[PDB]
Design a protein around this ligand. Structure first.
Ligand code: FE
Ligand code: FE
Ligand code: FE
Lengths: 279, 286
């Protein structure tokens, strides 16, 4: 415990400055710089684009949005608490605010593309009833809540949640951007994916200051495991084919993105998946 | 736990249309007052600081040391309790923005110490007072907050007390420096910070409203006055505001005037009946 700089009770500087971890602080300031609120996203032109979508297209989009809306207390409680380094706590405090902005944003999008209130709950009944939500909740137990959960495991899990889970949905929404549809959804999507990446990178940097890093095998387990989940969700459950994407290519993007994390965490690739997408 | 503020019945998937336009308004209001430390120019202060007297510098530096050591702990109370315990989405959003703001506050108090306190006369000797104020505070905050015996209702009040009152004295002390026209940076950031704490006090009072089981006005009163008592001991004994040319009797009054204003806000009766002694306390940005 005390053997860890990030957890060491002696890292809670007197107040703060002057900064001791310039790298961690730079990320905080970055976050601070990319601050934004839902209101900033213009949803004015969207409805005409929405109505130009085919029935199967509207089913896929309205569903992923709801899944986004479903996902959202790892950041709030554990890491903004266990880590003692002030620079890091400033970053987590900001990640909390932003996560809430993501939620307002998704609610806002659903609320305008789906006017009928009864349709909204017909939509969420299906959602909180599906596999991706449970298979993910269960995954969080085996790696975040369990007692044998070392701090290094949770840092890895954390980086997977931000970088591995939902990576496919961002890609799918990006895919629609190439077809030039729904400006407001696409704009908020890059804003949110940028934030997620920034969060994925932070978790990495946190991993990097670790004395007690878990085994590469243990890592590979959390990473690919979650890859499995993300993969079946977009291949089998909410087939990306529904919007004209290639079910197999998606399976490969997710794998590329996962290798990228592993290599970002210092380890070596395990899928050897090239990036299927050009965007 | 028949509390609508703590029941999971707190929304599911889609937060609109808003159920509590009440809290939501404050969240938007909070978002609208977003600011960062780098927006406060401290480049005219140092020369100002130098022209100050031994006691004024002693008073100012210590007040900042106390702000410093506190604002950053006032987050382990939000993060680990109010941001989680509460289920109403609207409130969760507000507490999230408060957490951020509180951090900007610590940055500012550090930037200020770091700019006025030349060398490590600060980390060494300045900060060995962490003084009965800091102590009686912990006790106060750990008997009405950190303890299990304490309900959620009491905590909200102990919350509004740490925000509305616990440092109301120092904000006042700095507005005094403004009256005197000293330390532009320090005084402007105090305007900004005090406006935030103000919003944060109001919020707790709004939460209290939604509570269904409010402790007894005899309990809501035991917390606030045990606060006033600590605050007053601090600014009239430990660091007499006389150091910057202020009237102690009057500062003891102002503190009381505020504590009352907090009581009325939580829908109760005054216990001092104290008038506001400082005419300069009618300002801009508040
Ligand atoms: Fe995130
Ligand atoms: Fe503060
Ligand atoms: Fe505050």
């Amino acid at each position: 415990s005390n053997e860890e700089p990030l957890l060491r009770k002696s890292s809670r500087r007197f107040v703060i400055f002057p900064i001791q971890y310039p790298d961690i602080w730079k990320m905080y300031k970055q976050a601070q710089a990319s601050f934004w609120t839902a209101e900033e996203v213009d949803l004015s032109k969207d409805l005409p684009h929405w109505n130009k979508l085919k029935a199967d297209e509207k089913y896929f989009i309205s569903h992923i949005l709801a899944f986004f809306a479903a996902s959202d207390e790892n950041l709030v409680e554990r890491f903004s608490q266990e880590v003692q380094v002030p620079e890091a706590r400033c970053f987590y405090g900001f990640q909390i605010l932003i996560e809430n902005v993501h939620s307002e944003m998704y609610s806002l999008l659903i609320d305008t593309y789906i006017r009928d209130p009864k349709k909204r709950e017909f939509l969420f009944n299906a959602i909180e009833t599906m596999p991706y939500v449970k298979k993910k909740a269960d995954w969080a137990l085996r790696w975040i809540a369990d007692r044998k959960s070392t701090f290094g495991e949770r840092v890895v899990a954390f980086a997977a949640v931000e970088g591995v889970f939902f990576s496919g949905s961002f890609a799918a929404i990006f895919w629609l951007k190439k077809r030039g549809l729904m400006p407001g959804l696409t704009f908020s999507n890059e804003l949110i994916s940028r934030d997620e990446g920034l969060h994925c990178d932070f978790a990495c940097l946190m991993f990097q200051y670790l004395v007690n890093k878990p085994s590469e095998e243990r890592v590979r387990e959390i990473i690919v495991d979650a890859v499995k989940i993300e993969q079946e969700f977009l291949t089998e459950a909410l087939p990306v084919g529904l919007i004209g994407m290639n079910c197999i290519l998606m399976k490969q993007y997710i794998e590329f993105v996962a290798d990228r994390l592993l290599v970002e965490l210092g380890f070596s690739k395990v899928f050897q998946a090239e990036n299927p997408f050009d965007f």
